[PDB]
Design a protein around this ligand. Sequence first.
Ligand SMILES: OC[C@H]1O[C@@H](O)[C@H](O)[C@@H](O)[C@@H]1O
Length: 371
Amino acid sequence: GLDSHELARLHELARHSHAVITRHQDAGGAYPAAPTFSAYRGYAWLRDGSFTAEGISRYGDVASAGRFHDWVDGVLRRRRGQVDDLLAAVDRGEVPSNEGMLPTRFTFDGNDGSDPWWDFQTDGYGMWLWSVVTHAARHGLDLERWRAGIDVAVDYLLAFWDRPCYDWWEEHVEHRHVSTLGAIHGGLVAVGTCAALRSAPWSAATLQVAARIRSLVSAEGVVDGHLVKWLGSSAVDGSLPACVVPFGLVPPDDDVAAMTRAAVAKDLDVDGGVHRFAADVFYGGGQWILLSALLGWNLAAAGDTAGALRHLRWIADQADADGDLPAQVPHHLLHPGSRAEWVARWGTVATPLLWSHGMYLILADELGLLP
Ligand SMILES: OC[C@H]1O[C@@H](O)[C@H](O)[C@@H](O)[C@@H]1O
């Protein structure tokens, strides 16, 4: 579905995506989120990093992806005691506050980069489980390399999956977000269906909890045939297609999958650029590369190759003169009056965003375009 002009440009953007991710990877293995964006400099997120790692793994850079997994594993093994203490607190009937939970931002040396009172999130731990299992399966690797870190993440998620937390967008701590539940589900199903992990003590529990997640989403996370942004809402969010591919709450051909893709397209997709959610005021609520990629990936998986390609083309059109992809662009803004204050406070939008490049690589690979 691409002519020679397009193929050459998409291949170049794929090469550049690999280069900019691997050039910015820290010496210790972490992928930074946004190396030139002042507010985020020096920090890694498991969400951004896991999708970045999946793009890199698909591209075939086994060494780079493995160094990311090494970094995450080591960071998590260092939290074995913190997690054990949280679990012991629960067993005494003393549920830990958000302030005591595992962090969202990490420094490259594995310390808390932010205070979880202000940004407590569980999705990234689920994403990491999905990512490391998927990588190991793809490349025929022994998961024992990363198993003790996997164990920490699994124990944590089995205890805390059903807690309210901030969403992927670091908002609304009181709610339970369907793409957060979806990320956890994806990670738990990945480990619970992995033959190499068949004897883990938590093996059965992971699939039972994944079923509990699906029960909760069925009860409170579906309205008018589509997934919704958080349990008990009516709105959609551009992250919701992740609950189809890759996280697997429903197959790509399920009616809920189709309806969710359609609702996201109708409510949030403007000319191929997907907004996060209707109420979004961050930088005025622009169009996010990673969300267009996510929708494209989902369209490809459902057999809508043309729709996938349209989103791939839109993403490529957002690359700057160096090939770098921003987090978002302002061609359409949901709340334009809100934009200038974000720019005054934090500067211009993060570019490159490694996750943008990682998602580009995933979609390109889905469409058979990795050179
Ligand atoms: O890139 C780091 C973080 O930036 C935030 O603005 C986004 O809402 C998160 O989804 C992302 O993980």
